Amino acid sequence: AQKDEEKMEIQEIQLKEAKHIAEDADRKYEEVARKLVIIESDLERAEERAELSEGKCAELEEELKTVTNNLKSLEAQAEKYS
Amino acid sequence: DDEETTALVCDNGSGLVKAGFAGDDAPRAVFPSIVGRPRHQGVMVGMGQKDSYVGDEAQSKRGILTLKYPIEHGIITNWDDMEKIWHHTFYNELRVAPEEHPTLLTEAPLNPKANREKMTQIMFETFNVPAMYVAIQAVLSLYASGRTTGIVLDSGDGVTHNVPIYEGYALPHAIMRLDLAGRDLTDYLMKILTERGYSFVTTAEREIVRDIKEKLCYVALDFENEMATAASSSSLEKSYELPDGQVITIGNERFRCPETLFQPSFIGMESAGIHETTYNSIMKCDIDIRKDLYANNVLSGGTTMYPGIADRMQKEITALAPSTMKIKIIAPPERKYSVWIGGSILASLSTFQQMWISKQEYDEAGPSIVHRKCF
Amino acid sequence: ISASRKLQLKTLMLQIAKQELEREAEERRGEKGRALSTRCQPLELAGLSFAELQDLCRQLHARVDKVDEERYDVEAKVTKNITEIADLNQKIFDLRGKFKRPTLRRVRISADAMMQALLGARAKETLDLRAHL
């Protein structure tokens, strides 16, 4: 019975240490979750703004093409009327 | 701005409602005229789901709506939806109450009377405007060009009409109104796309086919040569990315869709193309103003924005017309909003300020006032 | 430049804005009282006959009812404005509701703390079984 009491108290201090380790891990978990949420939100915004920029670039490119071609044709016609 | 009172130049159109205050260069708010009720059931509670999304809002939720245009061919077939569109236009896109602003609607030529009378009755009873005036959509497009003569071909999205005018005197016996327009071209394009495997059926996918038509189609200078070239080489096949991927490749459907304008036999219509109804409209005019009309042919409306139409039409008319006359086709870069720019100019005139249909006049003669002197 | 200094400058800006806004609020209240006093011409009824005073009171009655009509018109306008204000609030709620579905709630209430009662229940049932035998 004496030996068993010894083992009981040893396991008792071990259990307290275990609980503390558990709480520390819990706090770390909450922290990392917060960080991940923030960074993902930033990812959303970054992707969306990238898309906006790409679309606008496309539209401006097309308009440039059209106007340039019209100008070239009218230049040819100016020579013709000369 | 400040004191004083500005006029609202609305322009119902059929496909795009264009509105804005009188005296500017471009319409303030341009948005499709579609009203789409949701069609599925809806399970989320409290999402704030409305019963009808109108205007440009229904072009973003079109995946679960059934869009339906309230204006078929110039005429208005569904008055409640048109009233909803007008209410949206006044209150949310311009944010000006109509109780303090004159309005200048536009109407196609040769339209049913009841449409115009109902339009004025709505504007005077529901929205309660101070004074409204209805103008023919071609005279405005002639205003915008800064001319005073010329024969204007206003190929909108609902109806294509061709009003000749000389020295400010319109010729009522020479108006040739044809009901082929952008919508029929969209339907025909959607029908010939099925020859490659792409099937668009839903009323929402009609918008996708419209986008394809706008971005890719062009009018061929010579039809048979293009048909022969597209059948041998592959320099024409332009690809396009659907709203979900799966790019498609349009071959000789590119110049076959807008070719329907010059050969309305493609969609089974009997009449002659827009290249020959203009010549017929000219030949009905008197023998002494045909040279001026030949030299001042004006293009307007959205559907005349196809790349390469101002050359095909000139070639066709030069083939038809006598060899001595000079054929010139005025195609301003601001074609789409030409009618609205002309409307702004007309509403900004001082001489025009006493032509409005004042409300007391409507109270004395009823809605039939529009056919009277105040045209 | 550094975050702390920038936040201090922003706080100073907000405090200056708040103080000037409170100053303008008291100015607006005082000016509003002054204008309200100015609007009505003061009443001086000293030495008035029955006819004069009665006609004055009757006209004041009619004008008060007219003011009621005017306030009814203005308050109908304001009620329509309130309706469209609520509509705009609802529209912003709808535009933000794409991701705001799980936002309006309350979580981590009661079940997070109670963990060792189950162990007590197990020990109690085992002890009852052993003690009964």
Binding site: - | - | K32, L43, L45, L60, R71, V78
Partner: protein, 74 residues
């Protein structure tokens, strides 16, 4: 917007707003006291109307701002 309904509601509210009494059953000083009370009442009416005017101003300002900020999405 069915101004008949608005007129009916206006008639009901004017009934709520109706404050009509006798006119020939008082003495001179009582008449003066009633006139003073009526003046105070119309002063309150003026104050409430000015409050409504500024409230409507703020309503319109916030409506413009909210409209712009919802339009800024696109």
């Amino acid at each position: 917007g069915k101004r008949q309904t608005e007129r009916e509601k206006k008639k009901k509210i004017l009934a709520e707003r109706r404050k009509v009494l006798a006119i020939d059953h008082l003495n001179e000083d009582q008449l003066r006291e009633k006139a003073k009370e009526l003046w105070q009442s119309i002063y309150n009416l003026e104050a409430e109307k000015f409050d409504l005017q500024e409230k409507f101003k703020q309503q319109k300002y916030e409506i413009n701002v909210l409209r712009n900020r919802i339009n800024d999405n696109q």
